[PDB]
Design a protein around this motif. Sequence first.
Motif, short mmCIF file in Angstrom:
data_model
loop_
_atom_site.label_atom_id
_atom_site.label_comp_id
_atom_site.label_asym_id
_atom_site.label_seq_id
_atom_site.Cartn_x
_atom_site.Cartn_y
_atom_site.Cartn_z
N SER A 17 -13.22 20.85 31.77
CA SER A 17 -12.67 20.76 30.43
C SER A 17 -11.80 22.00 30.22
CB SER A 17 -13.79 20.74 29.39
OG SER A 17 -13.26 20.98 28.10
N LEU A 18 -10.59 21.80 29.72
CA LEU A 18 -9.70 22.90 29.34
C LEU A 18 -9.91 23.15 27.85
CD1 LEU A 18 -6.43 21.80 31.21
CD2 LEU A 18 -8.33 23.23 32.09
N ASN A 19 -10.21 24.41 27.52
CA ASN A 19 -10.61 24.78 26.18
C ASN A 19 -9.73 25.90 25.65
OD1 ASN A 19 -12.29 26.54 24.20
ND2 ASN A 19 -13.50 24.63 24.28
N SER A 20 -9.16 25.70 24.46
CA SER A 20 -8.37 26.74 23.76
C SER A 20 -8.94 26.97 22.36
CB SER A 20 -6.89 26.33 23.68
OG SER A 20 -6.72 25.13 22.94
N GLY A 21 -10.26 27.10 22.29
CA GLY A 21 -10.98 27.05 21.01
C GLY A 21 -11.67 25.71 20.77
N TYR A 22 -11.32 24.72 21.59
CA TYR A 22 -11.77 23.34 21.47
C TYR A 22 -11.31 22.68 22.78
CZ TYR A 22 -6.89 23.57 20.14
OH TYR A 22 -5.54 23.88 20.10
N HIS A 23 -11.97 21.60 23.19
CA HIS A 23 -11.50 20.81 24.36
C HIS A 23 -10.16 20.19 24.02
CE1 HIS A 23 -11.52 17.69 27.54
NE2 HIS A 23 -11.08 16.90 26.58
N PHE A 24 -9.16 20.31 24.90
CA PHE A 24 -7.88 19.63 24.68
C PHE A 24 -7.37 18.79 25.86
CE2 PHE A 24 -4.95 22.13 27.16
CZ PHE A 24 -5.58 23.34 27.30
N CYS A 25 -7.97 18.96 27.04
CA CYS A 25 -7.53 18.22 28.23
C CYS A 25 -8.59 18.31 29.29
CB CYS A 25 -6.23 18.81 28.80
SG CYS A 25 -4.70 18.07 28.08
N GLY A 26 -8.56 17.36 30.23
CA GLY A 26 -9.36 17.47 31.45
C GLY A 26 -8.57 18.11 32.57
N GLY A 27 -9.22 18.29 33.71
CA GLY A 27 -8.58 18.83 34.91
C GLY A 27 -9.51 18.57 36.07
N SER A 28 -9.06 18.89 37.27
CA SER A 28 -9.87 18.68 38.48
C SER A 28 -9.88 19.95 39.29
CB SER A 28 -9.29 17.54 39.33
OG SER A 28 -9.18 16.34 38.58
N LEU A 29 -11.08 20.40 39.65
CA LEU A 29 -11.22 21.61 40.48
C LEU A 29 -10.88 21.24 41.91
CD1 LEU A 29 -12.23 24.64 40.25
CD2 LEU A 29 -14.45 23.76 41.06
N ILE A 30 -9.92 21.94 42.52
CA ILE A 30 -9.51 21.61 43.89
C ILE A 30 -9.87 22.68 44.92
CG2 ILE A 30 -7.77 19.88 43.26
CD1 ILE A 30 -5.63 22.10 43.83
N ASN A 31 -10.18 23.88 44.44
CA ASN A 31 -10.89 24.90 45.23
C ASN A 31 -11.54 25.89 44.29
OD1 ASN A 31 -9.00 27.00 44.61
ND2 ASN A 31 -7.81 26.59 46.47
N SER A 32 -12.19 26.93 44.81
CA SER A 32 -12.93 27.83 43.92
C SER A 32 -12.09 28.52 42.83
CB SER A 32 -13.71 28.88 44.73
OG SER A 32 -12.82 29.80 45.34
#
Length: 223
Positions: A17-32
């Motif tokens: 979850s991408l958070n800027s004070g609140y959730h605004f988008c998803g994302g995918s972890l592709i390495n550490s």
Amino acid sequence: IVGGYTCGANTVPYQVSLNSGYHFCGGSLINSQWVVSAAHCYKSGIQVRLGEDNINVVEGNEQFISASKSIVHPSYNSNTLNNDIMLIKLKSAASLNSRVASISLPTSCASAGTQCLISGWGNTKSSGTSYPDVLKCLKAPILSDSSCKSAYPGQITSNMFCAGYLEGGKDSCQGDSGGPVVCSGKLQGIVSWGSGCAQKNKPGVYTKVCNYVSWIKQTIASN
Ligand SMILES: N=C(N)c1ccc(/C=N/OCC(=O)O)cc1
Ligand SMILES: [Ca+2]
């Protein structure tokens, strides 16, 4: 996600979850230290939240790590959404475990008919608004490029694919933006756009990640 199911806590370990004070988008972890999301998710002041299930409650498996930099694709066009992809680097490396894990980049593009898993904390209604607190999942097939182009005349580029159901009722939606479409354990898509959500003959449109593997690898190697 409209017409999906509750994933189960930490069952989609690459989902962020991408958070800027609140959730605004998803994302995918592709390495550490790197996350892939949608360029239309770009903003400053991003904190990456890993190991999330309920995004409103600290449940014990989270890692919260601020982004040090974001890199929007050089050819991203915000009007057409062509090249809707962005990389986000974490200020410190995530601790990887069974509940926080990277997802592999594709070695080849996936075909129409392939079943994929799409996930996010986006709107669950096709009319009106309801945001879930826990991660939602949808299993959906990739659609033919001909059916995708027929659904959206003049709008589908070679960097996009459709996935979902032409009958409607099952789709990603607002708030799922930037999140994963994973097929046979490979990241093949990023939630990008669509006309409303879960509408008949208006399937979800996804960034075609296999076209960006070279750019992703070379960018990561130098940043
Ligand atoms: N599959 C869809 N129908 C779909 C998917 C994603 C969107 C994204 N909208 O951007 C607003 C936001 O999330 O902040 C729209 C429709
Ligand atoms: Ca949480």
